[PDB]
């Protein structure tokens, strides 16, 4: 259950950032658009794609 978030709102950004200890996610396979897209890039690590 810790691996799942919701597509209804951009509340995953805080959850993922906290769960990754601020490292971010290495790869983001993005399909959502708008604020979800913006929040997705904001989770990228330094070398994230």
């Amino acid at each position: 259950d810790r691996n799942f978030c919701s597509s209804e709102d951009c509340s995953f950004e805080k959850y993922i950032r906290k769960e990754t200890k601020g490292s971010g996610v290495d790869v983001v396979i993005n399909t959502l658009r708008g604020k979800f897209l913006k929040a997705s890039r904001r989770l990228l690590s330094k070398k994230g794609k």
């Binding site: 950004e13 805080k14 950032r17 906290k18 601020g22």
Partner: protein, 49 residues
Amino acid sequence: HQALPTLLESVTIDPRVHPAQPPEGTTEFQVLPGKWDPVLQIAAAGGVE
């Protein structure tokens, strides 16, 4: 050092959830709780973010 703001990525103002203006001639004003979120870098108090 002295930091001069140069870019505010997002500023959300929602007066509908904000308390109404204090009655006329008010001397003591109410205090609204505020919170700083280091994970998301959000300064939120009342209906402002």
